[PDB]
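$ run holo --ligand "choline ion" --emit tokens
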Amino acid sequence: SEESGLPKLPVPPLQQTLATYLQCMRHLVSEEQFRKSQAIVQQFGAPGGLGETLQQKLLERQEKTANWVSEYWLNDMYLNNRLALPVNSSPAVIFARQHFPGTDDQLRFAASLISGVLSYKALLDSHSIPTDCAKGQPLCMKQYYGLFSSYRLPGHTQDTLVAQNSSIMPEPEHVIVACCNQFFVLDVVINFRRLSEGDLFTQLRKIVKMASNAAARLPPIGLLTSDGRSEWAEARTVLVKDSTNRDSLDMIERCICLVCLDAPGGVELSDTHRALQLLHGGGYSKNGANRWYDKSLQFVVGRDGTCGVVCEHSPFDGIVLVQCTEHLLKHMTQPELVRSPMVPLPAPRRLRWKCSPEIQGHLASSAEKLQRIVKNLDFIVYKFDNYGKTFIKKQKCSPDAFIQVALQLAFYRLHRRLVPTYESASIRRFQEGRVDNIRSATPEALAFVRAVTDHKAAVPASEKLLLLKDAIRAQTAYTVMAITGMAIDNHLLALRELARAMCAALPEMFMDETYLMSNRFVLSTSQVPTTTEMFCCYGPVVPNGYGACYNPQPETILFCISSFHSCAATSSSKFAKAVEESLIDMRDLCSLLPP
Ligand SMILES: C[N+](C)(C)CCO
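-- output --
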């Protein structure tokens, strides 16, 4: 064995992708532009043309690599993005509201949570995590091994995702505890010896005590990691000039994860508000500096009861993240384990920093930059409570396809147009499989939303229902296509970069405005279903777009909607309202008679 038995990501046929591509964009661009894109595409895919040359190189690439899109995808989707990670990239998972009468209640939670993480990592490292099935065939489990051994280094133009070697798994293993913007190294596993939940508690207390010492308070360096990727790369480059900083950064780069003991939030603890703290900490004046974004998992345990985890996206996606998080939470449910006695307990070490005039300048900039993000985010947690999966399945529809169609109607009734839409589609069936795109703004959806919104047309409800079902069928069809690696985004990306390798001047096929527009997801979505009382959320991917993450339950559907206040067009409240009306309209449509 020693090598995956899983299938390699397939390379869809050239003509299939080009035809689907055109079919996807026809209704999203003018007729004049579409007419030009048809010719451009026709020339790119012609017999003996450039497209076939690139296709052959891709087939060669498919043969020489475990996954032909991994590199291109990782860079295109995240490592090349220059936007600051908060809101723009790193999603957050909000746990249920906790009640911490005292600080020791907060600490005991953190201790229990840290314990859960150690136990989970043990399962991971012992390869005891049950291989996931495609809801089915085996799924790639590589993402799991990137949960605690990943760090994302900033770059001037391209970031670097660092994966720690197994042989280089530190001894002992440690977590970084963030408190009052101060970072402390907390060793948790010496010689296979895992710190007891009781010792972790004791260590956390020492950390809270030290973090509260003004004479030792250091600059809030974590604030720098909340800035644009090129900005952070520059500031980090300054830091690295000194030996003390290199040592501190290294400890952070090699920790298992961060545990953020956030200060109380000066606002009510509604789901929406808790989600905001988890997304950007509320800015420097709050907990915005009590973070370190490059690290994959940042578990937040707020003094006031606001808990959850901030996730860096480059290493793994939402499904794996949820499996982990729900396992931890469930483990915190199971009675406290036995083994917990140990004696000589060294005090946690505070990470030192060698400041300077420069760094102070970078700190001020980052604080201002992060403030713009906090002020620009328009976020809302809307809970649709009229129905959920149960009602939907009774309509012979996949809940996901049904919701994806509702989102299209919501966007159309509000903005009067459909836009290139993104929906994550897992391709974990294939080696190193991450995701591909499900383009939900289909031609069927357009016909459906138009029939619904065009009062003048006076389309009979019975006809609206047929259009509804056809849109849901088209959504399900594209979904199946994407997850079986037969979609088009990854395919076009690879053809694009292989071309770039040949000549920096990309083919007209990719310089075409239709192509550029097709990848500006004004509506970016994903379904992150949970069984616990937690939810995932994230920001939009373009200035004029939304970020819609839904969690469908048997009788309700949770919708986390984001957009930017800077764009006068978008409005999370109005979109959430449009979603409600669409789900109601769809229910009424499905509740009609036959013939
Ligand atoms: C924001 N996206 C939908 C692109 C990714 C969520 O996993």
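-- notes --
The radius of gyration is 25 Å.
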